[PDB]
Amino acid sequence: STDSQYLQSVLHSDIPLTREMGLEVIDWQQHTLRLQLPLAANVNHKSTMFGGSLYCAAVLVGWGWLHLRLRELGIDDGHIVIQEGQISYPLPVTGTAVARCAAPDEKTWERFLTLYQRRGRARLTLETTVSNDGSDEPAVRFSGQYVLHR
Amino acid sequence: TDSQYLQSVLHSDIPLTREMGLEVIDWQQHTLRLQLPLAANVNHKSTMFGGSLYCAAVLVGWGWLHLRLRELGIDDGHIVIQEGQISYPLPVTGTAVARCAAPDEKTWERFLTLYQRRGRARLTLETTVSNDGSDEPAVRFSGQYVLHR
């Protein structure tokens, strides 16, 4: 039983629309998370993935990174709130969408933990991408803010 | 009606929107409104999922442009969302009402002139989402939509 399977169950329970979107968590390795959405449940006009679904993938791979990282540190007293986001759509997604979130820079992460501990509230910005399966070229570039609060 | 037509477009083109409970409300004074129900779009704490709100915000801009072009008989174009930016200042705790009003009118005319002459033009649309009953934006969105032949 994996951290990915754990996170998938959390996402489907918390946000049941993600079950309808077919969200699947792929892997969690060296603080990189990947998840995917299938085309058919998220299609727009047969051929391409809906841009709203793509935002959902991009924002949720960041949400999941944060959830899993906190969980591995035993930080269980926080609530994540999705905040501002900026998204670009340089390429169409014509099949399964693979979303990825690598770790932020270590200093950013540690500043965020320090501020959360002191105030009980902090903001983390995560860069995420979504690609066509088998491509490293971002089809979607995303940056989003996440509040953690007690 | 125009709103029934657009709702049918959205549900047919993007079947996920039917599962999201999207309904189109009205199309008047070049302002479009559509809504999402809480239950289909809930998060872990009985507020609406930010992703659902983003979907509403981007789609009300898409719909605005689709209906405006349809009213003018401009049928040879393809709308693509190129860029989006969103903020979530207030919780949405019930039905969400997304709204797109008309951009600056000289801006619109310059955009159409550029599309007619060049075959490609970009339009920025601000859209909002509110809790039903209220005009106060709980969500602010800005999208860059490209129309091309």
Residue B105 makes CB contacts below 8 A (sequence gap 6+) with none
How far is residue A69's CA from residue A73's CA, in Å, rounded to a whole number?
7
| Distance (Å, whole) CA A17 – CA B4 | 24
Resolution of this model in Å is 1.0
Searching chain B, which residue's CA lies closest to the CA of residue A81?
A: B50
Nearest-Å Rg of the Cα atoms of chain A is 15
Q: What residues of A are in contact with residue B22 (Cβ under 8 Å)?
A: none
Q: Is the dihedral of CA A19, A21, A27, A31 positive or negative?
A: negative
B/e letters for B98-116, b = 16+ CB within 10 Å, e = fewer, are: bbbeebeeeeeeebbeebe
Lookup result for tokens 């929107």: B17
Helices B50-71, B2-13: axis angle to 10 degrees equals: 120
Asked if B82's CB is within 8 angstroms of A60's CB, the reply is no
Strand pairing class (A140-149; B23-28) = unpaired
From the CA of B124, how many Å to the nearest CA of chain A? 14
| Residue of B38, B51, B33, B139 lying closest to B94 (CA atoms) | B38
A115-140 burial, b at 16+ Cβ within 10 Å, e below that, comes to ebeeeeebebbbbbbbbbeeeeebbb
Which two tokens mark B39? Answer: 């239950």
Which amino acid belongs to residue B14?
I
Q: B95 at the A interface (CB within 8 A)?
A: no
User: What amino acid occupies position B124?
Assistant: T
Say how far apart CA B127 and CA B57 lie, in whole Å. Answer: 6
Which 73-92 residues of chain B touch chain A by CB within 8 A? 80-88
Under a CB-based contact definition with an 8 Å cutoff, are residues A93 and A49 in contact? yes
The DSSP secondary structure of B98-134, one letter per residue, reads EEE----HHHHHHHHHHHHHHSEEEEEEEEEEEETT-
Q: Are B34 and B8 in contact (CB under 8 A)?
A: no
Residue A26, class by beta-carbon neighbours within 10 Å (0-12 exposed, 13-18 middle, 19+ buried)?
middle
Record the tokens describing residue A28, joined without a space.
């969690």
Q: Is A149 exposed, middle or buried (0-12, 13-18, 19+ CB in 10 A)?
A: middle
Put simply, the answer to whether A55 touches B87 (Cβ < 8 Å) is no
Cα Rg of chain B, angstroms: 15
How far apart, in Å, are the Cα atoms of A94 and each of A42, B84, B114? 11, 20, 29
SS3 A104: coil
CB B7 within 8 A of CB B73: no
| The two structure tokens encoding residue A53 | 């679904």
Identify which of A20, A57, A150, A82 has the alpha carbon closest to the alpha carbon of residue B88. Answer: A82
Rounded to an integer, what distance in angstroms lies between the CA atom of residue A61 and that of residue A7? 10
Q: Measure CB to CB from residue A51 to each of B15, B81, B85 and give the nearest one.
A: B81
Q: Cα–Cα distance between A96 and A141 in angstroms, integer?
A: 16
Q: Where are the domains of chain A?
A: 1-150
